[PDB]
Design a protein around this motif. Structure first.
Motif, PDB file in Angstrom:
ATOM      1  N   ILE B   3      99.644  71.654 -77.890  1.00  0.00           N
ATOM      2  CA  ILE B   3      98.961  71.117 -79.069  1.00  0.00           C
ATOM      3  C   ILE B   3      97.750  70.279 -78.664  1.00  0.00           C
ATOM      4  O   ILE B   3      96.650  70.441 -79.211  1.00  0.00           O
ATOM      5  N   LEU B   4      97.923  69.410 -77.670  1.00  0.00           N
ATOM      6  CA  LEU B   4      96.813  68.554 -77.266  1.00  0.00           C
ATOM      7  C   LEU B   4      95.714  69.340 -76.555  1.00  0.00           C
ATOM      8  O   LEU B   4      94.538  68.991 -76.667  1.00  0.00           O
ATOM      9  N   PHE B  11      85.362  71.210 -77.203  1.00  0.00           N
ATOM     10  CA  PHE B  11      84.554  70.293 -76.419  1.00  0.00           C
ATOM     11  C   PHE B  11      84.205  70.874 -75.056  1.00  0.00           C
ATOM     12  O   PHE B  11      83.032  70.947 -74.688  1.00  0.00           O
ATOM     13  N   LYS B  63      58.250  66.434 -13.970  1.00  0.00           N
ATOM     14  CA  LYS B  63      59.638  66.867 -14.218  1.00  0.00           C
ATOM     15  C   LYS B  63      60.291  66.126 -15.394  1.00  0.00           C
ATOM     16  O   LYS B  63      61.007  66.748 -16.160  1.00  0.00           O
ATOM     17  N   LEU B  66      58.919  67.541 -18.721  1.00  0.00           N
ATOM     18  CA  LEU B  66      59.527  68.859 -18.930  1.00  0.00           C
ATOM     19  C   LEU B  66      60.957  68.744 -19.476  1.00  0.00           C
ATOM     20  O   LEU B  66      61.323  69.491 -20.378  1.00  0.00           O
TER      21      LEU B  66
ATOM     22  N   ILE D  42     102.077  62.351 -79.855  1.00  0.00           N
ATOM     23  CA  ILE D  42     102.060  63.735 -80.420  1.00  0.00           C
ATOM     24  C   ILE D  42     103.508  64.187 -80.679  1.00  0.00           C
ATOM     25  O   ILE D  42     103.787  64.645 -81.804  1.00  0.00           O
TER      26      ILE D  42
ATOM     27  N   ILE E  52      81.054  62.569 -73.812  1.00  0.00           N
ATOM     28  CA  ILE E  52      82.262  62.987 -74.518  1.00  0.00           C
ATOM     29  C   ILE E  52      82.752  64.340 -73.996  1.00  0.00           C
ATOM     30  O   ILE E  52      83.966  64.591 -73.937  1.00  0.00           O
ATOM     31  N   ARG E  53      81.838  65.183 -73.494  1.00  0.00           N
ATOM     32  CA  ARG E  53      82.218  66.469 -72.930  1.00  0.00           C
ATOM     33  C   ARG E  53      82.906  66.302 -71.585  1.00  0.00           C
ATOM     34  O   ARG E  53      83.931  66.951 -71.333  1.00  0.00           O
TER      35      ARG E  53
ATOM     36  N   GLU G  78      62.133  74.029 -11.029  1.00  0.00           N
ATOM     37  CA  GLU G  78      60.689  73.759 -11.026  1.00  0.00           C
ATOM     38  C   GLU G  78      60.378  72.258 -11.101  1.00  0.00           C
ATOM     39  O   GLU G  78      59.498  71.781 -10.386  1.00  0.00           O
ATOM     40  N   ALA G  79      61.116  71.506 -11.925  1.00  0.00           N
ATOM     41  CA  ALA G  79      60.939  70.063 -12.058  1.00  0.00           C
ATOM     42  C   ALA G  79      61.502  69.301 -10.851  1.00  0.00           C
ATOM     43  O   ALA G  79      60.858  68.380 -10.365  1.00  0.00           O
ATOM     44  N   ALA G  80      62.651  69.725 -10.312  1.00  0.00           N
ATOM     45  CA  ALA G  80      63.223  69.130  -9.102  1.00  0.00           C
ATOM     46  C   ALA G  80      62.290  69.286  -7.886  1.00  0.00           C
ATOM     47  O   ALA G  80      62.041  68.327  -7.159  1.00  0.00           O
ATOM     48  N   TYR G  82      59.086  69.543  -7.917  1.00  0.00           N
ATOM     49  CA  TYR G  82      57.914  68.691  -8.086  1.00  0.00           C
ATOM     50  C   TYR G  82      58.104  67.325  -7.402  1.00  0.00           C
ATOM     51  O   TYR G  82      57.131  66.736  -6.937  1.00  0.00           O
ATOM     52  N   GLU G  83      59.346  66.832  -7.328  1.00  0.00           N
ATOM     53  CA  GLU G  83      59.678  65.576  -6.652  1.00  0.00           C
ATOM     54  C   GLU G  83      59.980  65.782  -5.163  1.00  0.00           C
ATOM     55  O   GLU G  83      59.467  65.041  -4.323  1.00  0.00           O
TER      56      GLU G  83
END
Ligand SMILES: [Mg+2]
Lengths: 82, 95, 252, 51, 55, 446, 492
Positions: B3-4, B11, B63, B66, D42, E52-53, G78-80, G82-83
């Motif tokens: 009912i409810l 709505f 390095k 990079l 109710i 209300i919705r 390549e970076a290693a 360089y050092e």
DNA sequence: CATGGGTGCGCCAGACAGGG
DNA sequence: CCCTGTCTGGCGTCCTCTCACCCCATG
């Protein structure tokens, strides 16, 4: 568990209730004995008082069972020796 | 409950748009950004085509710079040495 | 750190383990009573109201101490000697110490009373259940005199409860309060207006007849229905309620 | 934001006959009263029947 | 996480005061019908029919 | 260990047996550190943060004294401009030259050149005073401070907790109506009236006829009258009404009585103060009621009649839960309630196992010292009064005093065996030593 | 400080017989790990300890890799280069970093890593030196008894485990008891118990006899087999190459003293000692002791032996719960059937009658001729089909034409029997003919053949209605299979 | 450095004088 | 010695929560 009235109705002293239930809970907790009533995950104190309410435990039955399960251990030892 | 509930029914192939970004948007160190601009690398799509061995030939690229470029490209899911077919798109060739 | 798993551990150890609550000026033995904990989101001990009349504890800034019975004999002494259900009579005399104190006697005194005209004056009702149904739906008033049919159990034999059902000329509120009275008490314990002396001897006659367990559960149901109908009563206090005598100035 | 604790009847402890006790959990910090009050009002009148 | 953020409390609630006033109905020839008139009090962040919705 | 003594190998110092440990602080309180002070006994090396605080306070005091000189110099130059309005005024020539020379302009020997000489005296005094005071303030910041015997530096930290409200705090009105706030309800459950507004606090009526403080109900009714006047001002101002109707209503609300002392009139407030006075009255109208010459009942009734409130002060109130009306209409109003500083997160305390005292091996006392509650003498009597014997035995041997007993107890509790090995209280041995330290020979027989 | 590093390295090297280098490598790794924990960021760290001073330098290590996945711990080649141009893939680039102060925290980490290195060096070399013990009867002290295992302490931080299945059924050990057992497996659970010890397996019996009987330890007597019911009864088979030594008498010892010592260590387990024979039948007779065997029949094809005993000895030959026959079967490797002399004769008569019936039915021979074939030792159609023609020609009354005809009949009988079974179920005939229709699994082909649909033609003749009761066959799938069968049979 | 040199309480009660 | 006045001792609720401050002095 709410009241302990019938546990005093079956052990009239209300101080012997504490000794009998403490002896019973010490047998159930550390000694590893099964509860004689099916629990509902209650603690061992309430299971002790719940066995008191059924009547199947008091000091007489506890002395009977300790004497019989001490005589059983010494009988097993004597039959193992001889 | 029925009912409810009945009383309430009125709505109820040059990567993607990231490749078209300038290298300055990569938050690189002022050193790394100026080293890339000196080699005419303007877009992320240009950078991604260069190999690590080519970038190490760039004057003043160390390095450390990079490693920074790799860590930043990896944070965006890009890697050095990807081949983009049809890069640069004709929309970039006129700037 | 208080992780998510220690609260289930805590609800395991609290269960069936009483604690000793203690008011700081303990004068007699009813000032140390053992309860079972119910965990509280908060920082304040929630203490059942009837028990307050034993501790002389109001709620104007009072403090209490909790003590934990560690060993197993002490848990059994807290449950079997010092539990709050076990202290329902004061040891100084025979008078009950779990007497309903202040809000609940106002809720009862407003409930079981009468007025000479209300909604549903002098209609007849087939039981206390539809008395409460007529009070809730909005067809009668809480105090409106009415013939009901109540079934009081008088235990006149040797431990056997004999039912006698009759029509009492009573009110709506007396039938609603009869829905809470245990079996053995007669209807005339609620037929009067129920001040504080009358509710104290109601609990006293319940303890002398039906023993301890119905008196504990009936003390709780008294407190619940007193609080609920005192809330429904809306019993305020105004400046107009203190009626000045018109004869006062001529007497002076 | 529209996701609440959708509840359920965890048990129907129907005590004896012509009498039940239906417990519903979990609801919000305030929806127990609104569903109890809605179902209570109710059932009391709206619910039809013959007598 | 830094020391420069400031946390305020959060009152995520658009409405202030909801008052219903039931009253008798006469539009329909049938009597014993009712009208439910709800005066809400929004702070402007929620449309009333949307409120209300959602309710 | 060999590796502990090998601190010298990789590094140096000596051995590592010494307990390395950083003084960490305890719990119970949140907060936000708002202010840190560092005081240094003179001679000790200032670390980098003490020099940061020294530069900070040097900078603050430098800016503050420089702003003292600038602000008072601005006032002095405004005085010079105020003097030179007349008597040799220069309307264009005044701001062509720098501002510190406003004295050698064309003006004879009058009171004005005398006043400019006095202001030059004041200005040079401010210059040399600023020099010597900035030197003295650098001395006060830079110097050390005399302190305790044998302390290097003191660090003080100010936590700033913000404590809100919770079930357990103590609130009270101004008449003796105390109370522990017991439940912080939601908004919906509150009893509302036939306008829509929920009430904020629900007191208890039964405290009035016994505890005879009937003044709080007159204070409640007069507070509702005050808020009724405030709501009517809020209604007459929210509709954007001109000042005439506000003047009418505020004048009617300020006359309203017998021969009184106030007698105000708004005809000398001039149409802008009345809007600001109504901006201050819109949250309610304050009402004075002197002590023994106060507002009688008929004046409260006539002020409740000025607002459209009911005369008896009682509105009928609906319920929040059921949504149906409370019978016999109830008293609402405004009461001025105070929060007291007996809070609940300053009294609440709990202890499993903490520190123990030194002379008698019992737990310490208090809350700051993490202590346990005194199981006093009357509680011992109250447990003798029951038949509780094991509870009292562990309450004064195991839980409290006996040290081997309580370590056996702690092992037995964490292993699941609820059992006590009793022993003797150690404070009874202290009693034996204090009686025995006299000429008395106390013993223990058998 | 300096000289103290050398004194610690020398003390540990001498006490644990461990290479100084392995201790330093581990201390370097320990210090690197302790350093990594002081930084909020995941860094790579190399520590280098100077072997003369004990001084140590800590780096920000940069694992030289080809492709960098972790920029915080990895650097490109390549970076290693360089050092430092000398660097290769897998080397480390360093960065001047403050060495962690050697507090009791690093000290504790160093101690733990040294202890772990000693477990993988000193204790590992001790286990290698005790190669005999890893296999022989080690002795341990019971440290802990659980429900499912017993933890033994062997000394020197070595822990062993006896599993529940590895224990004797009646043994009850307590913490502090001394227990012997065979180390039967070494795994890699250094932390905990890597050693597995047994008292129940046969190896425990063999090694107890090796210790108690010098002649087994001197390789004069060999144990050939051992069968065991742990804590109840065992059998061992012994051989010697020296004809002057009785191997059974040597294992029993003076008045049984040696076998009783082994039995006592096994909780009173009964041990039978039998002579190994190279003849299987004689070895089984010996294994059946103490029961007297009257006759043995050997079936080499089934690897089984029928053992006839006197009716009075039947219960002894089987033993309690079949224990004697089971231990004899495990000791010989043969399946042993124990029966009476009368039952063996009845079995042979039933087998001979079944062979005669089979030969009469399938070879179209008379019962008299079938009896002659069984008396000459032929029991199967396979023997008659495949045996060398010379053995069949040794039979009195067989000529080369009759032997050829008998073999052709035996081969034809076998072919018919095979085809029949393959058509009845889905072995080959229906697994090819009925299963020709695409979709037919072997199970469905056997279900079809159980209805008499043995061929692809039989399936093409069916209706959907005739197949509707076959579990797993829908009307659509039946219709598809019948149409597939018809397409092949009628339109191929 | 190390040690050592106020005057607002009131009742009960029993022991010590003090008359008696 | 039998009563009377005086003189000293012994004692006066329980739990808590902060705070402030603990021997000069000096040859
Ligand atoms: Mg109080």
């Amino acid at each position: 568990r709410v009241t302990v009235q019938d546990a005093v109705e079956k052990i009239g002293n209300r101080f012997d209730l504490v000794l009998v239930a403490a002896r019973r809970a010490r047998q159930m907790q550390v000694g590893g004995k099964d509860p004689l009533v099916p629990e509902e995950n209650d603690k061992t104190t309430v299971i002790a008082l719940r066995e008191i309410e059924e009547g199947l435990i008091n000091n007489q039955i506890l002395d009977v069972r300790e004497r019989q399960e001490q005589q059983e251990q010494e009988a097993a030892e004597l039959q193992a020796v001889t | 409950a029925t009912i409810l509930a009945e009383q309430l029914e009125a709505f109820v192939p040059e990567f993607d748009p990231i490749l078209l970004r300038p290298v300055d948007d990569l938050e690189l160190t002022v050193r790394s950004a100026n080293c890339l601009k000196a080699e005419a690398i303007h877009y992320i799509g240009d950078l991604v085509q260069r190999t690590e061995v080519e970038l190490l030939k760039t004057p003043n690229l160390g390095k450390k710079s990079l490693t920074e470029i790799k860590d930043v490209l990896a944070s965006r899911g890009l890697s050095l040495g990807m081949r983009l077919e049809n890069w640069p798109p004709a929309s970039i060739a006129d700037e | 750190r208080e992780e998510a798993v220690v609260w289930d551990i805590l609800d395991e150890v609290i269960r069936e383990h009483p604690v000793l609550l203690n008011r700081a000026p303990t004068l007699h033995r009813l000032g140390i009573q053992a309860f079972e904990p119910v965990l509280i989101e908060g920082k304040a001990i929630q203490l059942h109201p009837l028990v307050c009349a034993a501790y002389n504890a109001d709620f104007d800034g009072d403090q209490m101490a909790v003590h934990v019975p560690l060993t197993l004999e002490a848990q059994l002494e807290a449950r079997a000697l010092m539990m709050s259900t076990n202290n329902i009579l004061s040891p100084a005399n025979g008078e009950p110490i779990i007497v309903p104190s202040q809000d609940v006697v106002l809720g009862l005194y407003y409930m079981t009373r009468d007025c000479v005209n209300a909604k549903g004056e002098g209609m007849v009702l087939t039981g206390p259940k539809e008395a409460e149904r007529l009070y809730r739906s909005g067809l009668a008033s809480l105090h409106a005199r009415v013939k009901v049919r109540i079934t009081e159990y008088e235990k006149d034999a040797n431990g056997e409860l004999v039912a006698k059902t009759s029509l009492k000329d009573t009110t709506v509120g007396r039938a609603i309060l009869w829905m809470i009275v245990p079996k053995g008490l007669p209807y005339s314990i609620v037929n009067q207006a129920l001040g504080k002396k009358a509710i104290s001897k109601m609990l006293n006659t319940c303890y002398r007849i039906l023993g301890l367990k119905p008196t504990v559960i009936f003390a709780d149901q008294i407190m619940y229905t007193g609080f609920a109908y005192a809330a429904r009563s809306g019993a305020s206090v105004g400046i107009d309620d203190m009626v000045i005598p018109e004869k006062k100035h001529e007497i002076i | 934001v529209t996701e609440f604790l959708k509840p359920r009847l965890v048990d129907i402890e129907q005590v004896s006959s012509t009498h039940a006790k239906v417990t519903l959990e979990p609801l919000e910090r305030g929806f127990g009263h609104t569903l109890g009050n809605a179902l209570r009002r109710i059932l009391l009148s709206s619910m039809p029947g013959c007598a | 996480r830094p020391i420069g953020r400031l946390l305020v409390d959060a009152c995520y609630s658009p409405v202030e005061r909801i008052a219903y006033n039931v009253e008798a109905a006469r539009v329909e020839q049938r009597t014993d019908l009712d009208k439910l008139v709800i005066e809400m009090e929004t702070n402007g962040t929620i449309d009333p029919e949307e409120a209300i919705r959602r309710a | 260990t060999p590796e502990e003594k090998l601190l010298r190998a990789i590094f140096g110092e000596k051995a590592s047996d010494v307990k390395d440990s950083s003084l960490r602080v305890p719990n119970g309180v949140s907060g936000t550190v708002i202010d840190v002070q560092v005081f240094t006994r003179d001679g000790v090396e200032k670390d980098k943060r003490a020099l940061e605080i020294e530069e900070m306070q040097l900078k603050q005091a430098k800016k503050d004294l420089s702003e003292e000189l600038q602000i008072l110099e601005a006032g002095l130059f405004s005085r010079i401009r105020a003097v030179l309005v007349a008597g040799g005024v220069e309307a264009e020539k005044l701001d062509k030259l720098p501002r510190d020379r406003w004295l050698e302009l064309g003006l004879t020997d009058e009171e004005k050149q005398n006043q400019l000489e006095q202001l030059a005296e004041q200005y040079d005094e401010l210059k040399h005073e600023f020099e010597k005071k900035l030197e003295a303030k650098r001395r006060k910041i830079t110097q050390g401070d005399d302190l305790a015997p044998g302390v290097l530096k003191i660090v003080k930290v100010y936590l700033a907790v913000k404590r809100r409200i919770q079930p357990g705090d103590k609130m009270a009105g101004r008449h003796g109506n105390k109370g522990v706030i017991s439940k912080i309800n939601p908004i919906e459950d509150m009893p509302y009236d036939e306008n829509g507004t929920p009430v904020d606090i629900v007191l208890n009526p039964l405290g009035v006829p016994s505890r005879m403080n009937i003044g709080q109900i007159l204070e409640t009714h007069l507070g509702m009258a005050a808020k009724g006047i405030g709501d009517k001002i809020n209604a007459m101002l929210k509709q954007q009404q001109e000042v005439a109707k506000l003047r009418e209503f505020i004048q009617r609300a300020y006359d309203l009585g017998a021969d009184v002392r106030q007698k105000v009139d708004l005809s000398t407030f001039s149409d802008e103060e009345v809007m600001r006075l109504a901006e201050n009255l819109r949250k309610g109208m304050p009402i004075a009621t002197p002590v023994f010459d106060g507002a009688k009942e008929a004046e409260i009734k006539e002020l409740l009649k000025l607002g459209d409130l009911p005369t008896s002060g009682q509105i009928r109130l609906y319920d929040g839960r059921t949504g149906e009306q409370f019978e016999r209409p109830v008293t609402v109003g405004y009461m001025y309630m105070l929060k007291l500083n007996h809070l609940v997160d300053d009294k609440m305390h709990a202890r499993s196992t903490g520190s123990y005292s030194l002379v008698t091996q019992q737990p310490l006392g208090g809350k700051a010292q993490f202590g346990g509650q005194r199981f006093g003498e009357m509680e011992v009597w109250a447990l003798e009064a029951y038949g509780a014997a094991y509870t009292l035995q562990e309450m004064l041997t195991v839980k409290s005093d006996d040290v081997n007993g309580r370590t056996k107890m702690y092992k037995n509790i964490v292993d699941g065996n609820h059992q006590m090995e009793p022993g003797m209280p150690e404070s009874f041995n202290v009693l034996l030593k204090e009686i025995r330290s006299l000429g008395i020979n106390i013993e223990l027989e058998d | 400080m300096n000289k103290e590093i050398l004194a610690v390295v020398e003390a540990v090297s001498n006490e644990k017989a461990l290479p100084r280098e392995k201790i330093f490598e581990a201390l370097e790794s320990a210090l690197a790990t302790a350093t990594k924990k002081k930084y909020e960021q995941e860094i790579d760290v190399r520590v280098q300890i100077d072997r003369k001073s004990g001084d140590f330098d800590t780096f920000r290590r940069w694992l030289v890799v080809d492709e960098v996945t972790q920029p915080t711990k990895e650097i490109t080649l390549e970076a290693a280069r360089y050092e430092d141009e000398s660097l290769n893939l897998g080397d480390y680039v360093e960065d001047q970093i403050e060495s962690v102060t050697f507090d009791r925290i690093t000290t504790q980490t160093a101690k733990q890593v040294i202890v772990q290195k000693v477990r993988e060096a000193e204790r590992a070399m001790v286990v290698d030196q005790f190669r005999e013990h890893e296999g022989e009867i080690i002795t341990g002290v019971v440290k802990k008894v659980n429900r499912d295992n017993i933890s033994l302490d062997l000394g020197n931080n070595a822990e062993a485990v006896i599993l529940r299945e590895d224990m004797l059924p009646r043994e009850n050990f307590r913490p502090g008891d001394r227990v012997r057992g065979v180390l039967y497996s070494v795994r890699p659970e250094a932390r905990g118990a890597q050693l597995f010890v047994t008292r129940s397996k046969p190896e425990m019996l063999i090694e107890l006899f090796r210790i108690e009987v010098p002649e087994i330890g001197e390789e004069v007597i060999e144990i050939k087999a051992a069968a065991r019911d742990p804590g109840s009864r065992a059998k061992i088979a012994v051989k010697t190459n020296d004809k002057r030594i009785d191997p059974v008498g040597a294992c029993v010892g003076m008045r049984g003293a040696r076998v009783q010592a082994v039995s006592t260590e096994l909780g009173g387990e009964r041990i039978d000692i039998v002579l190994w024979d190279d003849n299987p039948a004689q070895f089984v007779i010996n294994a059946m002791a103490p029961a007297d065997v009257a006759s043995i029949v050997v079936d080499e094809d089934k690897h089984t032996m029928d053992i006839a005993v006197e009716a009075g000895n039947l219960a002894q030959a089987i033993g309690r719960n079949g224990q004697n026959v089971r231990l004899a079967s495990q000791l010989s490797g043969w399946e042993l059937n124990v029966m009476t002399v009368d039952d063996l004769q009845a079995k042979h008569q039933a087998e001979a009658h079944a062979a005669i019936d089979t030969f009469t039915k399938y070879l179209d021979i008379d019962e008299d001729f079938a009896t002659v074939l069984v008396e000459e030792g032929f029991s199967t159609l396979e023997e008659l089909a495949y045996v060398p023609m010379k053995e069949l020609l040794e039979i009195e009354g067989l000529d080369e034409p009759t032997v050829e005809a008998l073999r052709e009949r035996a081969k034809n009988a076998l072919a018919t029997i095979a085809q029949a079974q393959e058509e009845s179920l889905g072995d080959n005939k229906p697994a090819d003919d009925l299963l020709n229709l695409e979709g037919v699994d072997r199970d469905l082909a056997f279900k079809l053949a159980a209805r008499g649909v043995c061929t692809l033609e039989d399936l093409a003749e069916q209706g959907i209605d005739d197949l509707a009761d076959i579990e797993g066959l829908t009307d659509e799938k039946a219709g598809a299979l019948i149409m597939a069968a018809r397409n092949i049979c009628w339109f191929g």
